[PDB]
Amino acid sequence: CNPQQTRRKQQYASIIGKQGLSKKQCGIFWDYYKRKCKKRRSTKKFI
Amino acid sequence: RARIGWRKAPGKYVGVKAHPLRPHDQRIKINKRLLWQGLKIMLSAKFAQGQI
Amino acid sequence: GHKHSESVLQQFYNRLPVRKRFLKAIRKGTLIWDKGQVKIPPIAMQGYGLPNKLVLPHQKEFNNKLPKFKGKINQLKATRIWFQD
Amino acid sequence: LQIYPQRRVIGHRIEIFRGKHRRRRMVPPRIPLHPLAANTSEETASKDMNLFETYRDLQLRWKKTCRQRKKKFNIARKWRMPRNIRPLPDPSWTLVFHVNPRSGYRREENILQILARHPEKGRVEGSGRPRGADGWGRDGPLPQWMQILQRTPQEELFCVMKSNVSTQHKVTAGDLIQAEKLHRKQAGDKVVFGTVMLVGSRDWTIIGKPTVPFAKVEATVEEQTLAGETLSFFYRKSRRVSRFRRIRHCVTMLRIDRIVVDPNMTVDPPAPKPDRLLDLWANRWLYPDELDGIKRNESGEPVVSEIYDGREHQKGSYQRRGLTASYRWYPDPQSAHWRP
Amino acid sequence: MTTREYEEAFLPRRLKRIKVFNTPPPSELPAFFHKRLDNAHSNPRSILKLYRQ
Amino acid sequence: MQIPRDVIFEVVRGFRGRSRNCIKIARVRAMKALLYSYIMRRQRQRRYRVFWIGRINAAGREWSFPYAWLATSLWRQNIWLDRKMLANLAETEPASFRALVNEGKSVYFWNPDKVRDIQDL
Amino acid sequence: IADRVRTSWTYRHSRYSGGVRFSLPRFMVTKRTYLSTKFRRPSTVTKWGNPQYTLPSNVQREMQQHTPKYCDMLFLHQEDQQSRRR
Amino acid sequence: WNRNPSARYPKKGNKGCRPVCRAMRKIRKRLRTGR
Amino acid sequence: MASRGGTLWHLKEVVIQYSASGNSSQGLRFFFRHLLHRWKQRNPQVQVHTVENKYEAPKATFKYLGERTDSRCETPLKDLSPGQIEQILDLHRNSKGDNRFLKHGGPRTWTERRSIQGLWRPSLPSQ
Amino acid sequence: AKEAAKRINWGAYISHQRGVRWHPQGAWRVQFSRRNHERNFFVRCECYFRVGT
Amino acid sequence: LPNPLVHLDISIGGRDAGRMVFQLFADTHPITAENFRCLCTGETGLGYWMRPRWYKSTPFHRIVPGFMCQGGDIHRGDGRGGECIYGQFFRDERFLYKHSKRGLLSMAKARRQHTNNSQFFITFDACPWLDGEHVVFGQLQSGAEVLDQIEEQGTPGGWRKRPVEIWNCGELLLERPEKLYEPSEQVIPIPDDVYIKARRGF
RNA sequence: UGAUAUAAUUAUCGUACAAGCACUCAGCUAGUUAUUGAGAGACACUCACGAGCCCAAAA
RNA sequence: UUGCGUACAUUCCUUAAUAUCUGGAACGAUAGAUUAUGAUUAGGUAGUGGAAAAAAAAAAAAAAAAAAA
RNA sequence: GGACUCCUUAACUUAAACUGAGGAGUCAAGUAGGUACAAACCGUACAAGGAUUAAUUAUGUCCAA
RNA sequence: AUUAACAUAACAACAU
RNA sequence: UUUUUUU
RNA sequence: UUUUUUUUUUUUUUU
Alpha helices for chain C (secondary structure H): 8-14, 20-28, 60-64
Across the interface, of K187, K189, K194, the residue whose CB is closest to J4 is K194
CA distances from D1 to A40, D4, D56 (A): 89, 9, 21
Residue type, K69: C
First to last CA, chain D: 53
Which chain O nucleotides are covered by protein, judged by CB under 7 A? 3-6
Task: Please report residues of D whose CB lies closer than 8 A to that of F97.
Answer: none
DSSP code of residue D179: E
Which residues have C-beta within 8 Å of that of residue K33, sequence separation ≥ 6? K3, K4, K24, K25, K26, K137, K138
Tell me, rounded to whole angstroms, the distance of Cα G67 from its chain centroid.
30
D234 touches chain F (CB under 8 A): yes
Q: Strands, DSSP E only, in chain H?
A: none
| Nearest residue to K10 (alpha-carbon basis) of K157, K118, K171, K144 | K144
Q: Give the C-alpha separation, E50 to F13, whole Å.
A: 82
| Nearest residue to G71 (alpha-carbon basis) of F65, D202, D172 | D202
Question: What is the Rg, in whole angstroms, of the alpha carbon atoms belonging to chain I?
Answer: 22
Q: Give the C-alpha separation, G79 to D100, whole Å.
A: 10
| Nearest residue to I71 (alpha-carbon basis) of I84, I61, I59, I85 | I61
Q: Give the C-alpha separation, C75 to C68, whole Å.
A: 13
Cβ G52 vs Cβ G46: under 8 Å = yes
Cβ D205 vs Cβ D234: under 8 Å = no
Q: E strand or H helix at D245, and its extent?
A: strand D241-247
Which residues have C-beta within 8 Å of that of residue K28, sequence separation ≥ 6? K96, K137
Residue A14 CB: number of other CB atoms within 10 A? 9
Q: Give the C-alpha separation, D86 to K136, whole Å.
A: 15
SS3 state at I70: coil
Go through B18-34 and write b for each residue having 16 or more CB atoms within 10 A of its CB, e for each that does not. Answer: eeeeeeeeeeeeeeeee
SS3 state at C23: helix
Mutation choice for H interface testing from C5, C8, C14 by most H CBs within 10 A: C8
Q: CA dihedral in degrees (K192, K193, K195, K196; nearest 10)?
A: 140
CA distances from D214 to D60, D94, D128, D260, F28 (A): 72, 12, 9, 9, 59
SS3 state at K10: strand
Which residues have C-beta within 8 Å of that of residue I28, sequence separation ≥ 6? I16, I18, I58, I77, I80, I85
Cβ I3 vs Cβ I56: under 8 Å = no
> Do the chains contact at C9 and H3, CB–CB below 8 Å?
yes
Tell me, rounded to whole angstroms, the distance of Cα D207 from its chain centroid.
21
> Cis omega (within 30 of 0) on the bond before D87?
yes
* Strand O lies under 7 A from the Cβ of residue A35: no
Residue C10 (CA) to nucleotide L59 (C1'), in angstroms, measures 106
| Nearest residue to D169 (alpha-carbon basis) of D244, D252, D291 | D252
Residue D175 CB: number of other CB atoms within 10 A? 21
Q: Give the C-alpha separation, A9 to A16, whole Å.
A: 10
CB pairs under 8 A between F and K: 13
Which chain L nucleotides are covered by protein, judged by CB under 7 A? 3-5, 7-10, 12, 15-16, 24-32, 35, 45-46, 48-49, 53-55
Alpha helices for chain A (secondary structure H): 3-16, 23-26, 30-40
Handedness of CA D127, D129, D135, D140 (dihedral sign): negative
Full DSSP string of D260-308: EE-TT--PPP-----S-SHHHHBSSPPPTTGGGG--B-TTSSBGGGGT-
Residue type, C41: P
Q: Give the C-alpha separation, J22 to J6, whole Å.
A: 21
Strand partners of residue D259: D217
| Nearest residue to D232 (alpha-carbon basis) of I98, G29, I109 | G29
Residue type, I124: L
Strand partners of residue J30: J20, J47
- Backbone dihedral angles phi then psi of residue C39, each to the nearest 5 degrees: -145, 165
- Backbone dihedral angles phi then psi of residue C53, each to the nearest 5 degrees: -85, -10
Q: Give the C-alpha separation, H12 to G84, whole Å.
A: 51
Q: CA dihedral in degrees (F31, F32, F33, F38; nearest 10)?
A: 90
Cβ K88 vs Cβ K126: under 8 Å = no
Q: E strand or H helix at K95, and its extent?
A: none
Full DSSP string of J12-45: TS---STTEEEETTTEEEEEEEEEETTTTEEEEE
Residue type, K179: K
* Strand Q lies under 7 A from the Cβ of residue C12: yes
